[PDB]
Structure 1
C-alpha cells in the first residue's frame, strides 16, 4: 500500500550544530532493526543508503553562522535524493542527523509535491534567520529558509543559493513547543503560523490537538503530509540522548498518538527522524531508550497500532 511504501535515506550530518555524535543517528537506528521491523509490518522498504557528505575544509562563518557551505551542500544533496525517492512513488524516510537537514528534506519533497503541508514536532520552532540567531547553529534556522513570507529577510548565505522558499506560513503546524527564542516568538506571532505549544497540548489534550492540526491542513482538500520529527519534541524521560533536551515534553503516548493519527489519513509522504545523538546519553540505557522511542515513533507512522494489527485473512479458520 502507498502509506506503507518507503524509501530510506540515511543523512549522517552534524555540522548544523556544535555537538558531535548526531551523525551516528542513521547507524544506531539501522542497528536497532528499523528496516526489518518495517518489513514485518507489511511495508515495501527500499534502502537508498547513507549519503556521503564530503568534507568542506576552510568553511569560514557567514557573520556568526557556523559551517554554512557544509550545511548548504548536505541539504542540497538531500533535496536531490528525497526528490528521487518521491519520483519512485515512495514515502521518503530521512534518518538524521541534525534538524538543518529539513531544508533539503522539505525542499526536495516540495519539488515533486508543491502542495505539501508540514507537521513540525519539536520543543523548538527552528524559525531563526541567519540574522536573528544568537548561536549561529543552522539546525535552529531550517524553517526560515523554507518560508515564502521570510523571502527578503534571509541574506545570501554561502552554500544556500540553490534554496527557493517552498512553503507558506499557513502550510505548517507546530506541535510540542516549549523553548522559543524572542526573535522566533516574534516571527511565529507576526506571520500568524498555527502552533500547539505544550500549553495548548495541556489545555486541549492530544486528541483535540490532532483533530485541529489535520482539519487545518486537510480541511480544504486532501494534500501530502511531511512530518519533520525532532526527538526533543518528546520529554527527556523518553528521548534523553539529544542535543537540546527540554523538560515538560510530549509523553511517549502523545508521540504515538500524533503518528498513529497521521498514518490514518493515508497522506504521509515525507518523514524526518532527527536530532538522535547516541553520544549524548548519560548511560548506555539512555541511548537505547532514545533509539527505541525513535523506532516506535517511526513504526506508528507506517501503520503499527496500539489496538493491534492483523493481515486480511480469517484467523478463526
Structure 2
C-alpha cells in the first residue's frame, strides 16, 4: 500500500535521471494505481570517486533501512553504483534475491576493470572488490543473484561470474527460451525469497531507450520488458526497486524515463486485465 521514492543524482548526464523520472510522472501514476506515495527527495551527492560514492551510498543504505517495514522503496538514479547502497539498505539484514535487469553485469573488480565504480556494484554486493566498498555493502550471496538481458561482458567479468556461480541469462538465452520461461526460472531459482529488482535502462534496445550512457544493440523489446515485470509482480515477492542509468542528455523527448516509469508500474501490479 505504501511506496517511498528517493533519488540519487549521482554521476561519478545520468545525474539528471531522477528529475527525468519524476517528470515522467512516476509518482502521480503510482497514486492512480492505488498506492499512497511519499517522495523522500534526493540523497546528497558530492578508483575514481570511490570515497564520494561510498559516502552517498551509505546515506542511501541508512535511509532505506529506516523505512518502516511494509514501505516499498523505489530508488531513482544516475549511476548504477547507487545499488550498493539500495540493495544493502533494502535487504534489512535479511537474505534477499536480486534480479539484475541490465545489458551489463556490473560484476567487475578493481582488478578486472576503465576503473569506473558503476561497473562493479553487483560484484561489491556479492562481496567481491575493493574492501572499502565490500565492508559496508556486501549484502547478497552470488547464488541468490540472477542477471537478465546481458549482452556485453568484459573478459575478467566472465571469469568472476562463473567462479561465483551467478545465474546469467544473456540475450542468447532470452532469444532461445523466451522471457516467459526465463521469468519463471528466475522465480524458481530465487524461490521463497523477497526480491529486489534493479532495472538499468540500457537493458532495453537502444532504438527504444536511447537515453542511456552505454547503449548496446539487440536488447529487450517494450513488450518483453513489460512481460518480465508483470510475471515478477505476479509472484508477490518483489519488495524493492532501482530505476537507474536514465540519461536525459542522450534521450529523446524523455521517452527512456517514460519507459522505465511504465515498467515500474507493471512491476507494482499494473495490468491490462
Instruction: Give the TM-score normalised by structure 1.
Output: 0.83
Q: Secondary structure at the match of 1:163?
A: helix
Counterpart residue number, 1:165: 138
- For 1:38 and 1:244, the matched residues in 2 are separated by 28
1:126 to 2:106 alignment:
yes
What is the alpha-carbon distance in structure 2 between the residues aligned to residue 252 and residue 223 of structure 1?
A: 27
Contact 2:124 2:130 in 1 (8 A): no
Aligned residues: CA RMSD: 1.4
- Point out where structure 1 has 5 or more consecutive residues left out of the alignment: 16-20, 56-64, 309-317
SS for the counterpart of 2:78 is: coil
- For residues 107 and 294 of structure 1, the distance between their equivalents in structure 2, rounded to whole angstroms, comes to 22
Task: Tell me which of 34, 52, 60 is aligned to 1:70.
Answer: 52
- Determine if contact 1:76/1:162 at 8 Å carries over to the other structure: no
Deviation at 1:84, TM superposition (A): 1.6
Output aligned runs, 1:229-268, within 5 Å.
Answer: 229-268=199-238
Q: Report deviation, 1:74.
A: 1.1
Which consecutive unaligned segments of at least 5 residues does structure 2 have?
none
CA contact (8 A) 1:210 1:261 kept: yes
Summarize the Cα distance change of 1:214–1:156 in structure 2 as closer, same or farther, 3 Å threshold. Answer: closer
**Rounded Cα–Cα distance in structure 1 between residues aligned with 2:244 and 2:130:** 26
Task: Decide which structure has the larger Cα Rg and report it.
Answer: 1
Q: Is the 8 A contact 1:260 1:301 kept in 2?
A: yes
Offset from partner CA, 1:198-237 (integer Å, 9 cap, x none): 000011011110111111101xxx2210000000011101
Normalising by structure 2, what TM-score?
A: 0.96
Partner of 1:199: 172
Instruction: Report how far residue 303 of structure 1 moved.
Output: 1.1
Deviation track 1:256-305 (CA, whole Å, cap 9, x = no partner) reads: 01111111111111100000001113xxxx24221111111111111111
3-state SS in 1 of match to 2:198: strand
How far apart in 2 are the matches of 1:191 and 1:14?
Answer: 28
User: How far apart are residue 163 of structure 1 and its match?
Assistant: 1.3
Q: Distance in 1 between matches of 2:165 and 2:237?
A: 25
Aligned residues: 273
Q: Distance in 2 between matches of 1:89 and 1:127?
A: 30
d(CA) in 1 for partners of 2:72, 2:93: 12
What is the aligned counterpart of 1:290 among 252, 256, 259? 256
Task: List 4+ stretches of structure 1 deviating above 4 A.
Answer: none
